[PDB]
């Protein structure tokens, strides 16, 4: 019934709030400006990065490489918030432990880029739990292999954010992504699709009720999931370029 789908949406929203402290609502307030009690420091070039560097990884390498490696560090931090959120998705913890691992392994990147768009506008991205803001232009200016890393993320985010989803929408969308029955090496696919069908029903009703004037938003959101998959494949592609072409190494395992 409709009530049960709404209860599931609410349960997911409350868990999401518990697992992810920097929510889209909080982040949008910062990107604009409501009661500026603590306006974030803006990193717009090499010198402003230094300015903030010894304001709050530390210095002793190519800035380009410290920024790229900082991306790695934060992304592993994020995996842990996502893993905990996943446990709250009804039916996830009762899946084969091995399939849980696989679901997380191949879903975490798509989720990071989804939630990263909450922290972005067309001109830059919130960093350090929202205390900083790094410009898209500065990131774009970094050394050749590295100057192209965030751009596809920004491009996705501008198009994704024009959908105007809120946290209650995103909570369900994220759960839908995790419960993807098409991940490599899953053992028991049917149970996963069974849960995803329930989550898709809940997502569909959520968007129809929250965005009644946005025609076919549900289909449009599903379409963004090929966008996300492509972004990940490029990012993974890009990580090969690096792995082979650098004197630099010291990655988060």
Ligand X SMILES: CCCc1c(OCCCn2ccc3cc(OCC(=O)O)ccc32)ccc2cc(C(=O)c3ccccc3)ccc12
> Which residues make up each annotated binding site for rosiglitazone?
72-75, 109, 235
163/229 with CB nearer a copy of itself: 163
Binding of a copy of itself by 57 (CB under 8 A): yes
By a kind-dependent CB cut-off of 5 to 8 A, residue 14 interacts, out of ligand X, a copy of itself, none, with: a copy of itself
User: Interaction with a copy of itself in 192-251: which residues (CB under 8 A)?
Assistant: 194-195, 198, 243-249
Binding of a copy of itself by 122 (CB under 8 A): no
The total of other beta-carbon atoms located within 10 Å of residue 112's CB is 20
**HSE (CB half, 13 Å, CA atoms) of 15?**
22
Question: Do residues 177 and 225 lie in contact, with contact meaning Cβ atoms separated by under 8 Å?
Answer: yes
Binding mask 210-229 for ligand X (x = CB under 6 A): --------------------
Q: Which two tokens stand for residue 173?
A: 């969308």
How distant is the alpha carbon of residue 77 from its chain centre? 12
By a kind-dependent CB cut-off of 5 to 8 A, residue 172 interacts, out of ligand X, a copy of itself, none, with: none
73/230 with CB nearer a copy of itself: 73
* Nearest Cα residue to 124 out of 49, 196, 223, 72: 49
Largest CA distance in the chain: 59
- Tell me how far, at minimum, the Cβ of 122 lies from a copy of itself, in Å: 11
Q: Which two tokens stand for residue 132?
A: 């900083």
User: Looking at beta carbons, which pairs linking 95-98 to residues 24 or more positions away fall under 8 Å?
Assistant: 95/188, 95/191, 95/192, 96/187, 96/188, 98/187
d(CA 221, CA 208): 12
226/245 with CB nearer a copy of itself: 245
185/230 with CB nearer a copy of itself: 185
Among 76, 189, 209, 251, binds a copy of itself (CB under 8 A): 76
d(CA 239, CA 206): 36
d(CA 191, CA 39): 46
Using CB under 6 A, list all residues that contact ligand X. 53, 66-68, 70-72, 74-75, 112, 116, 125, 127-128, 134, 139, 149-150, 153, 251
Using CB under 8 A, list all residues that contact a copy of itself. 1, 4, 7, 10-11, 14, 17-18, 28, 31-34, 36, 57, 60-62, 73, 76-77, 80, 83-84, 87-94, 97, 100-101, 143-144, 162, 164, 191, 194-195, 198, 243-249, 253
């Amino acid at each position: 019934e409709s009530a049960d789908l709404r209860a599931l949406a609410k349960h997911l929203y409350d868990s999401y709030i518990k697992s992810f402290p920097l929510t889209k609502a909080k982040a949008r307030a910062i990107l604009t400006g409501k009661t500026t009690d603590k306006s974030p420091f803006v990193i717009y070039d090499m010198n402003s990065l230094m300015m903030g560097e010894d304001k709050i990884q530390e210095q002793s390498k190519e800035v380009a490489i410290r920024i790229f490696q900082g991306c790695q560090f934060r992304s592993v931090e994020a995996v842990q918030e996502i893993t905990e959120y996943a446990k709250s998705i009804p039916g996830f913890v009762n899946l084969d432990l091995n399939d849980q691992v696989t679901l997380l392994k191949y879903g975490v990147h798509e989720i990071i880029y989804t939630m990263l768009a909450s922290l972005m506008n067309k001109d830059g991205v919130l960093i350090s739990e929202g205390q900083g803001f790094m410009t898209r232009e500065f990131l774009k200016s970094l050394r050749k292999p590295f100057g192209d890393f965030m751009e596809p993320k920004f491009e996705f985010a501008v198009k994704f954010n024009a959908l105007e989803l809120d946290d209650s929408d995103l909570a369900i969308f994220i759960a839908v992504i995790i419960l993807s029955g098409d991940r490599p090496g899953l053992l028991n696919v049917k149970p996963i699709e069974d849960i995803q069908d329930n989550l898709l029903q809940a997502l569909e009703l959520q968007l129809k009720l929250n965005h009644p004037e946005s025609s076919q938003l549900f289909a449009k959101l599903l379409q963004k999931m090929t966008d996300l998959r492509q972004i990940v494949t490029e990012h993974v592609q890009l990580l090969q370029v690096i792995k082979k072409t650098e004197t630099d190494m010291s990655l988060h395992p």
